[PDB]
Every structure is written in C-alpha cells, then in structure tokens.
Swiss-Prot record, chain A:
The keyword Ribosomal protein does not apply. The keyword Zinc-finger does not apply. Belongs to the CarD family. This is RNA polymerase-binding transcription factor CarD. SMART domains: CarD_TRCF. One of its GO terms (biological process) is rRNA transcription. It comes from the Bacteria. Disulfide bonds: none annotated. Controls rRNA transcription by binding to the RNA polymerase (RNAP). Required for replication and persistence during infection of mice. InterPro entries: CarD-like/TRCF_RID, CarD-like/TRCF_RID_sf, CarD-like_C, CarD-like_regulator, CarD_C. It holds the Pfam family CarD_C. The gene is carD. Keywords: Virulence.
Amino acid sequence: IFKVGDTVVYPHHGAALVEAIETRTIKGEQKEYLVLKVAQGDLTVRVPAENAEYVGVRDVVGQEGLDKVFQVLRAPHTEEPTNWSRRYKANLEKLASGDVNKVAEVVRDLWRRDQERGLSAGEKRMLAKARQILVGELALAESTDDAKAETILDEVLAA
Amino acid sequence: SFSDPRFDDVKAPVDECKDKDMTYAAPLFVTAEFINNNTGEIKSQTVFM
Amino acid sequence: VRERMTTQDVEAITPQTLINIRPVVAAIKEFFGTSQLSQFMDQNNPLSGL
C-alpha cells in the first residue's frame, strides 16, 4: 500500500510525507513502522504499517472526491434549528470526524453565517482552523499551491 | 516521555542584556515523545521549553 | 499533562498540546527573582563581588 514519498493525509494532522519504514521489533515482533512526519505540526510520527487504516491514515483525496467535496460545499441550505450552542457542539464533532466532506460542510455553514450575521471569537477560530486544514487538503489534492486553493474556495463559496 | 535537552545560543549578548534590562537567557528545546499503548504511535517533536 | 491527558481526545493530541511550559517558566522566574538565595550581587569592589 504505502511507500516512501507518499503524500498522505493523517487525521487529524492533515497532510504529511513518509520518509521510510524502520525495521523495529516490539515484543519480539519486528514491526514495519512507517516513519511519517507532518509539515503543519512540524513533528514526526511513526506508526506500524498494519494499523494505518485503523488509526485512520488515508491516501490523498482523488479528483472525484474533490468533485464531491466541491459539490458538498455547493450544497443546499439544509441547516440546523435554534440553539447555536447545540450546533457548536455538533459542528465541532463534525470537525473531529476528520472527514473532508464533513469538514467542508462545517466551513460552508460558518461561511453562510459570517457572510450574513457575524460569528463570535470561538466561531471564527473554529472556521479558521477548519478552513486551514481544508486548504491544506485541497492544495495537496489538486497538487497545487496554497493561495490557489483558498482562491478556489472563495470562488466556489460564491456560487 | 522526554529526552535530549539542548540549548540554542543566547538571544542577547551580556552587555545589551544589562542595558535594555533583558534577562540574559537561552532557550530550552526538549524532544518530547507521546506513545499510545492500545494502538502504538509516537508524537515526537522539538518543544520550546 | 496527565490532567489534560484524558480530557483531550485520543488519536488527536500532540505533545505540543500536552506540554504546558508556563508553570516551569513561572517557577524559574520566581526563583531568580524574589528568593532569599537569589541576591543582588554585592559589588562595591572586586573582593566583595568575589
């Protein structure tokens, strides 16, 4: 599955690259830990090859996944009722889910909010971090530059 | 788990510290390490201390 | 660390988010200043400095 140079997503730390796989033994078992280090967090994280999908690591989103996430960011109005604190807990859970589709739904909801009403400090920090991780994902899914992805966001948010 | 305390060079030379009231100091970096037993990982960084 | 070791969500924490240095830095800074073994260097000549 995985090899050196695999541009890979890692919940929750977003995108990151692998340097190698070290032949380390734990409990008499020479496990093949893959040594992966992220760019955002600035840290390395090595993990067994086996439990990759179990912890939740994933190949970068393919172009059809990109199309679906754009379609989810261009999604309809479907919204939550009153108790914004209820929605705060909800969309924070969504963020914690680490799925690109759900995170896009988070950022789209907060976009329709801060466009119209105006968030609070916690709301804006929420939207900021969500947009950060989503920009990282899009930049490394299109295989493009940073500001390009945010521009694609603001232009897809517009429609 | 912690390990490997290393000092970078001082941030201000002595005389300028004494002048501007800067306390003559130097940063600590400590290579931390987080390990989950149930699944098995490492979260190794270079923390500013 | 062990306090927020569980309040945080597993498979999401980083040591940077676990480690809080503020108590360390406060402890040091309240040692060198304001502690009866951290004194003004009594320098009214080289011998007193020594």
